Design a protein around this ligand. Structure first.
Ligand SMILES: *[B@@]1([O])OC2=C(C([O])=O)[C]=[C][C]=C2[C][C]1[N]C(=O)[C]1[C][C][C][C][C]1
Ligand SMILES: *[B@@]1([O])OC2=C(C([O])=O)[C]=[C][C]=C2[C][C]1[N]C(=O)[C]1[C][C][C][C][C]1
Ligand SMILES: [Cl-]
Ligand code: NA
Lengths: 246, 247
């Protein structure tokens, strides 16, 4: 990751909504990043569903996910969101953030291989304590916005310690907007509303390919009410629009 | 490819517009396809810019295209479309159908390796006569809608005779619509307007992933006027909407 400079002017998009959070934006060609809050940019938080990115790669690497067209069948038993109550492709399970699919992937990966790949990926504090099926949701794993950008830059370049094939598979699964000269890869996360004095976290991470430029981004915010969740996309979108990226 | 059945009811979407053409639609789970015109479905036409799909794969396989993120720089000399007068990524050059980028790729691949890979890919009549940089636009290469579907089905499954990595690279470059439970990969082609009695050809080929289903499609039509070109998407889109796919 390049140098990073604090630009406190981006705080305008945050104060307008009374949000405590951070945005990190890096422009690949210039090896330079900017953030509204240097200290928070390095602060580590639960990854929540952003962990679907490494978990998918690891599932493929270990053979738990058999290939890019594996279907994850629904057993017909209640799941916490109706959007999850159906058979899913890998891309579908990522896009609708289907926790139970990824919990079973994690169980089958198992703790040894999971620890091994988080080391290889330099993924946050690499702490998988708290149960193999939940450490990224309610356990001790933490990652910063800076580290998310670093991880995504490696993924973009196919430089993670995993096959290029499996990195490409997960990349296509992360596409969220496609136009002739504009392509977005992204992933949301949301840990919940937290507890008294201890808010939850909401994330949006990804990158934008516009013409021949690439912009890597990571956003997180404190959240204690689900009604604020749209801000996790609207604040970074407004910043990126102000930068002319869109 | 699975079975194929002629459905003449789809002809309503063509006759309403006075278009001579064919649509082939295959549903993966049922290994079954339908078409408005079985004979035309097997008839071979110039691929035009649909050839960017194999050409891109071959460019990567031979190392002419260095990797996924190679930039094709514009030398500043006039090109046939303003949309091509800029540096392009591989996806960009595919999506805007930048002919001069792919002519240079083809020249560097060369006739021998090009011929080898079109045999490996079972790509139409495999006839690359007419100049290494022009055979798919004005030469003797021809491919049918059925063969386009077969080729795309192989690409979807990473079963072409090329690395899995290079097949995946070209697949992401073909994405044209992305939603949480709906994803489209597609490529247009247009050979020109030809003449009266020797019309050009226009194509739309690709596939749709909707929930856990996959629908492969190929459309072509005769075209003698550039103003008709939008039909190359609107006819297949209306058929796929009528099928409940939407597209
Ligand atoms: B995950 O963090 O992603 C997610 C999102 C999102 O990312 O914005 C929104 C709704 C559900 C999910 C699934 C994952 N989050 C959770 O498991 C979380 C849901 C709310 C209760 C606490 C657990
Ligand atoms: B190619 O066939 O793709 C294309 C399309 C399309 O895909 O439908 C539309 C406009 C331009 C192009 C570039 C390629 N076609 C040509 O180069 C062709 C355009 C008309 C005159 C003869 C050359
Ligand atoms: Cl659940
Ligand atoms: Na089929």
């Amino acid at each position: 990751m390049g140098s990073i400079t604090e630009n406190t002017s981006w705080n305008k998009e945050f104060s307008a909504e009374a949000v405590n959070g951070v945005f990190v934006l890096c422009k690949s060609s210039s090896k330079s990043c900017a953030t509204n809050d240097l200290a928070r940019a390095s602060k580590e938080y639960l990854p929540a569903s952003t962990f679907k990115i490494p978990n998918a790669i690891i599932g493929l690497e270990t053979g738990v996910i058999k290939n890019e067209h594996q279907v994850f069948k629904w057993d017909g038993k209640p799941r916490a969101m109706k959007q999850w109550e159906r058979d899913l492709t890998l891309r579908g399970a990522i896009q609708v953030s289907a926790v139970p699919v990824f919990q079973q992937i994690a169980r089958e990966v198992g703790e040894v291989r999971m620890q091994k790949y988080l080391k290889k990926f330099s993924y946050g504090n690499q702490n998988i304590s708290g149960g193999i099926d939940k450490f990224w949701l309610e356990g001790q794993l933490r990652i910063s916005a800076v580290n998310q950008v670093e991880f995504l830059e490696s993924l973009y370049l196919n430089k993670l310690s995993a096959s290029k094939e499996n990195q490409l598979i997960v990349k296509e699964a992360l596409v969220t907007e496609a136009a002739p000269e504009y392509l977005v890869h992204s992933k949301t996360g949301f840990s919940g509303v937290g507890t008294e004095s201890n808010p939850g976290v909401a994330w949006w991470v990804g990158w934008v390919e516009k013409e021949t430029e690439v912009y890597f981004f990571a956003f997180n915010m404190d959240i204690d009410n689900e009604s604020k969740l749209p801000l996790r996309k609207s604040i970074p979108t407004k910043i990126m629009e102000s930068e002319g990226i869109i």
